[PDB]
Amino acid sequence: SALEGKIAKLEHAEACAATASGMGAIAASVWTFLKAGDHLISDDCLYGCTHALFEHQLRKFGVEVDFIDMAVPGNIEKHLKPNTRIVYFETPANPTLKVIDIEDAVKQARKQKDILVIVDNTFASPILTNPLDLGVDIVVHSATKYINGHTDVVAGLVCSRADIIAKVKSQGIKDITGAIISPHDAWLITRGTLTLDMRVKRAAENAQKVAEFLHEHKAVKKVYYPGLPDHPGHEIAKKQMKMFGSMIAFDVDGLEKAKKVLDNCHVVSLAVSLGGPESLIQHPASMTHAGVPKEEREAAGLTDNLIRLSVGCENVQDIIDDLKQALDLVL
C-alpha cells in the first residue's frame, strides 16, 4: 500500500487498489458492483479483452450490455435504463484514439442515481488526465503503458473513494478475481513512479513530433493522434489532457505496405502488447486480431490499413529515422 498511496495521490483519489493486471483492475471493479439484472453501458471503442469481458462474460451472468458511440452527444442518457449501474469508457480510445468528453459523459450519467462512471485512464496516465477531478467514480489502469517504468511487469490499478476501494479489495480482488498483485511487481511499479512525470511528458512530446512527421509522409493516408489539430475531438483532448499521450495510429495503402513497414523497423520494435519506455509498433489486424474475420474487424473499427504505435522515451530523431526509412520503402 506504499504503492497504492503513491498512485492514489497521483490520480487525486482517496485510495487505490493494486491488482495483477489491467484486466484485473477492470474486472475487480465491474464484478464488484454488478449483479444479475443490472445494466452496463460501454463505449464501442474498447481494448479487445475489455470488449470480450462485457460482450460475453457479463452477459453470461445476466448483465444487460449496450455498446454505444459515447462521442455522440446525448447518447449515454438516451441509453439509460432503470437498472443502469455502470457507464464505462476509455479515452483516447481503442485503435483510432477517439476522444470522449469526460465531464460531459459524467453529466449524462448523473441524470440518474447510483451510476458508477468508470474510466480506463491507461493511455493518458495520471500525469496527463485525472478523470476523478471531473466527477468519474473509478479510474483503472494497466501499469504496463507508463506506471511500471521498465516492463516485463504486468499489474493493474484501481483508484477511487475509500469505501469503493474497500469493496474492490475485499470482494473484487479477494473473492471474485483473485487478481492479487505480486509483491515483486509492486516494488517495481513503485520504482517506476519516481520518473513517471518525466517519462510520460517525454513520450508525449516525442509522439507529438512523430505524429507531425507521419502527418506529412506520402505513404501515410491518415494519422490518428489527439494532438493534431485535424483530429476529431482535438479540442476535447486539449481541455482534459495536459499533453496528448504517447499512442498514435495511422493508415497505410493496404496489408502489404503495413507488413513491409513493420518488416523494416529496427529501433521501433514489433509487439503484441503496447506501452512503456520502448517504442513499439503493431499491425493489429494480423497481430492481435488474426483469428477474427475481416468483416468483424472492420465492423468494429479496425482495417487492414491500420498501424498502431506506442512512442517511447528514446531520442525522437532515432524514432523518426526508423519510421522514415520504413515508410519510404513502401512508396
Which of 3, 11, 21, 280 binds a second copy (CB under 8 A)? It is 21
Q: Which of 107, 86, 78, 74 is nearest to 39 (CA)?
A: 86
Long-range CB pairs of 180-183 (<8 Å, 24+ gap) are: 180/19, 180/20, 181/3, 181/18, 181/19, 181/20, 181/155, 181/156, 182/20, 182/155
Number of residues that bind a second copy (CB under 8 A): 58
Query: Which of 79, 161, 191, 222 is close enough to bind a second copy by CB under 8 A?
Result: 191
* Nearest by Cα to 165 from 266, 32, 51, 63: 32
319 with 312: CB under 8 angstroms? yes
Among 59-67, 69-77, 82-90, 299-307, which window interacts with a second copy (CB under 8 A)? 59-67
CB of residue 83 vs a second copy: minimum separation in angstroms? 14
Least spacing, CB of residue 158 vs a second copy, in Å: 11
The single residue among 75, 112, 171, 303 that binds a second copy, judged by CB under 8 A, is 171
How far apart CA 244 and CA 281 sit, in angstroms, is 18
Closer CB to a second copy, 112 or 171, in the complex: 171
In the bound state with a second copy, the residue whose beta carbon lies nearer, of 80 and 180, is 180
Is 75 near a second copy (CB under 8 A)? Answer: no
H-state helical runs in 34-172? 48-52, 59-60, 75-79, 102-109, 125-128, 162-167
Residue closer to a second copy by CB (options 108, 208) is 208
CB 158 within 8 A of CB 171: no
What cell numbers appear for 38 in the block? Answer: 443490472
The span from the CA of 68 to the CA of 50, in Å, is 14
CB of 245 to a second copy, least distance (A): 17
Mark the segment that binds a second copy (CB under 8 A) among 25-33, 107-115, 302-310, 321-329: 25-33
Is 108 a binder of a second copy (CB under 8 A)?
no
Instruction: Report the first-to-last Cα separation within the chain, whole angstroms.
Output: 52
Q: Which residues bind a second copy (CB under 8 A)?
A: 19-28, 31, 34-36, 49, 52-53, 56-57, 60-63, 149-154, 156, 171, 174-185, 187-188, 191, 194-195, 197-199, 202, 277-278, 312-315
